[PDB]
Amino acid sequence: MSLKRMLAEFEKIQAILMAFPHEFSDWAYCIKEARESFLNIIQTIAKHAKVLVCVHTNDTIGYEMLKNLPGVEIAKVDTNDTWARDFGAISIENHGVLECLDFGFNGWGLKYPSNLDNQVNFKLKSLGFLKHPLKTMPYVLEGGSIESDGAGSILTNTQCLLEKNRNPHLNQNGIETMLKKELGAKQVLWYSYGYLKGDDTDSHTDTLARFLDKDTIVYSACEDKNDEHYTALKKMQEELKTFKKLDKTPYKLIPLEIPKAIFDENQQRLPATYVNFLLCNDALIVPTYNDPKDALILETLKQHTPLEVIGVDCNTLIKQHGSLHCVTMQLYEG
Amino acid sequence: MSLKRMLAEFEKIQAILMAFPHEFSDWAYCIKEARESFLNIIQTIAKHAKVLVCVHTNDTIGYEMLKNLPGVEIAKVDTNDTWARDFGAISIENHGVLECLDFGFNGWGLKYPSNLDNQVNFKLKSLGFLKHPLKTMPYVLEGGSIESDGAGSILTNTQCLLEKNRNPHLNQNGIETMLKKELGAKQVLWYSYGYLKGDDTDSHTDTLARFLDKDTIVYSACEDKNDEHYTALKKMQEELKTFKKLDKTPYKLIPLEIPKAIFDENQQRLPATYVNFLLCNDALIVPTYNDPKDALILETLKQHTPLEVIGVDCNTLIKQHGSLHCVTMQLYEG
């Protein structure tokens, strides 16, 4: 209960927590396509970190697909959806001791059912998959709505944290206080602008602005003044420029232009973003959308990291309004 | 913050909060039937207490139906469903001053979306419909899962309150402590048995055991040893017999046999119960299910209350796994 820190995603990762898609959710419409895509993502991540996949107790087809995958372990646990990033435990370092925090997940502001997602951490712990202390938190918080630099700086936005169906009894100050007490944040970087059409997580920061490293901040941008995102993303860029590290020096900002508009069978725009990447040990796995800009995005990133930049198609994922990072949650071992 | 009490349902009621059914929910399948039934229920309650109905902002058909109903006021507020009993504010008396508590409603353990339901109290307050202080509570609690006798005794069960998706960070003692601090309960009556097939509120007490008055407790029973409820309801009856008022004397128990099994188009059994009644000033409005037992239930109740016993058909309501009481929430004025 004194001097704790939230491990950064770019630190040494033991395994990546995921949840395989099943017929008992929204993936039922294209479950076949869902399985293939996830299988591809899983095999790619497995080459850089162990993978712990939650497979629904009545998901035989899925279990047989992951049963013999190298560097993949299966945990039989039911889920509502595959967004492990938002219901997965948050890992902190309490006085040097590793500790997992089981914050409440209520479906992005009670918009979707989450009776199973919210219990995943508990089940994984009782099943022995989490070899660390699991403390239950009396606050609603998604792992994708916050960003840690691993040194006291927590990046987040008001669009999500101040949403009425999260922690309504608290004010911005009350929420910032819990972030400092529960995550050990010494500085909370707040910004209120920026959004992604088709997204209903209330603008998770992991799709808008994130830490590439201790001194660098990556964010979504748009130059097409004709796109509906231009104005909002520009204001956010201005807000990000006011941020300062704990040493009072400014952050290195790296913009990532959003791909060309993408739509589904119902002509609904999807929230594609290259910001929803995954720092996975020796490799930086970045989402691609079969868009002319993919190649540029990858190269742009190779010039700000010694890590191997690998792209993986996420066109199937965004169909459900979420990308790569939202489907994962890193775990450590100390 | 000292000496508070939760007003009983059998006390002087100013108005009954309800939410009209609309096409933007599960009622869309039989919205026409839903409207008729609700209209009937509303007109019946209006004859004993004012009614405040939440009408969806884009529910024109509904607004025109309630627009000129005597003793009915309309508040334009969106909702997910019509269960005002579970998302409606809980009224207490703080040192004599009336106060409304806006507890969190997360869809009965995150089983259903509740982004709109959870915000109803706040919207009604900002719109001026609630002329009392509205304090936001950091706990999840449904009004139908608890019962107040108006004198310090709070009746409830573990099936609901100890459910993992309610207040997981607390233990039974932690929950009982908040009940004593927030509701002013001096005694909490706990029971762990009893259930209703087809119900997914996790056995709300308002469908199993309730206070008919300060000294009386009404509960659901079953004599058909062939029914799946027999064993469970009998154990609950034994638990209820151990309860004692604050003066150490036992409670007067009144059993109400559940109607003959009822099913929907998909042959799914529905949670019908006569316990889901409504104490409405000078009248006791009781649910009926066009079952041979209705007549008996009404007469049985007339012999334990000077109030007028009126029955109202709830066959349409139970189709959505809930009865009369679940569709209401009384409000006071002090």
Side-chain angles (χ1 to χ4, degrees), chain B residues 167-285:
Chain B
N167 294 292
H169 69 294
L170 296 176
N171 63 312
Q172 187 173 182
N173 165 279
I175 291 166
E176 160 160 347
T177 305
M178 91 88 150
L179 289 182
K180 298 192 175 188
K181 169 179 158 50
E182 304 311 324
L183 306 182
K186 291 190 291 287
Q187 185 190 207
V188 178
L189 315 169
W190 294 95
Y191 69 81
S192 303
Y193 287 95
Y195 78 90
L196 256 56
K197 183 65 177 180
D199 158 272
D200 45 51
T201 73
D202 293 306
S203 298
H204 273 180
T205 194
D206 76 342
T207 69
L208 284 170
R210 295 184 53 190
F211 282 127
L212 178 58
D213 64 63
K214 210 291 185 53
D215 315 294
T216 314
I217 286 180
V218 184
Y219 63 97
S220 308
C222 175
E223 286 305 327
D224 175 43
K225 305 188 180 186
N226 294 309
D227 196 65
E228 76 177 82
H229 296 292
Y230 189 73
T231 301
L233 292 176
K234 275 306 175 189
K235 293 184 186 175
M236 175 186 85
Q237 183 181 65
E238 305 302 345
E239 289 185 299
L240 297 174
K241 277 186 293 184
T242 73
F243 287 163
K244 266 84 192 70
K245 297 201 272 287
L246 280 184
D247 66 356
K248 301 302 173 296
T249 68
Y251 277 85
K252 180 189 303 177
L253 299 182
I254 302 177
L256 295 182
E257 297 187 296
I258 56 176
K260 205 68 180 183
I262 302 175
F263 302 84
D264 46 42
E265 46 269 300
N266 295 58
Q267 290 311 81
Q268 299 303 77
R269 188 165 188 179
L270 304 176
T273 176
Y274 298 90
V275 169
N276 219 56
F277 57 75
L278 190 167
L279 296 152
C280 201
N281 285 319
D282 69 313
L284 172 62
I285 310 172

Side-chain angles (χ1 to χ4, degrees), chain B residues 115-154:
Chain B
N115 56 300
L116 302 179
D117 294 336
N118 196 42
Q119 298 182 78
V120 174
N121 294 319
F122 175 81
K123 289 182 182 181
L124 287 174
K125 173 61 173 175
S126 69
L127 287 165
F129 289 99
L130 279 167
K131 285 76 166 55
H132 293 296
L134 187 66
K135 186 170 60 189
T136 27
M137 299 287 85
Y139 309 94
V140 180
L141 189 68
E142 296 100 40
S145 68
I146 60 173
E147 277 281 320
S148 175
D149 74 336
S153 288
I154 296 299

